[PDB]
Ligand binder design. Structure first.
Ligand code: HEM
Length: 153
């Protein structure tokens, strides 16, 4: 469970993300693909992208990044009270896209990397720790929902 102070640190940096959702989304997905190429090879929609420049130029990838961060932001704003938001996400990701928890760890890493790269003055040790807890809670709760659906991700 996160303290109220921890949630406030999470939402403080998230407001910075929201100043340019598309840009952050692109950077996060590109970082994910670079750091864990196996993730991209799983996304049929995007696996044709060969270079970083191609990734940045893709309107489709940019739109997707906004979809991803919008869903995550909606979850974070509930400060743990996120069952109604998390359930549909677990449903598609367990049964349609088949995304193991390890891949959610990878994207969590990319999120933290990009937030630190862009907002170091608002993303120091304590804020990083809080965001890490928030993403940990997200992954824990989604794993439980995965199992309820019969997926051992
Ligand atoms: C922060 C974690 C994530 C969030 C919030 C998120 C969110 C979303 C949302 C909102 C959608 C569109 C609706 C849906 O199908 O559920 C989506 C689609 C999808 N996600 Fe995720 N996702 C996350 C992580 C991942 C990871 C790590 C992968 C792959 C390694 C992945 C693979 C996919 C795929 C393949 C689609 C379908 C894309 C398409 O063809 O349109 N997701 N995701």
């Amino acid at each position: 469970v996160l303290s109220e102070g921890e949630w406030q640190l999470v939402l403080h940096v998230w407001a910075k993300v929201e100043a340019d959702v598309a840009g952050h989304g692109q950077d996060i997905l590109i970082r994910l693909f670079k750091s864990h190429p196996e993730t991209l090879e799983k996304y049929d929609r995007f696996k044709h992208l060969k270079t970083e420049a191609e990734m940045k130029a893709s309107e489709d990838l940019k739109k997707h990044g906004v979809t991803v961060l919008t869903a995550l932001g909606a979850i974070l704003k509930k400060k743990g009270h996120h069952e109604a938001e998390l359930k549909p996400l677990a449903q598609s990701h367990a049964t349609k896209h088949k995304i193991p928890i390890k891949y959610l760890e990878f994207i969590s890493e990319a999120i933290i990397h990009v937030l630190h790269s862009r907002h170091p003055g608002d993303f120091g040790a304590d804020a990083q720790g809080a965001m890490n807890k928030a993403l940990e809670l997200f992954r824990k709760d989604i794993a439980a929902k995965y199992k309820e659906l019969g997926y051992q991700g």
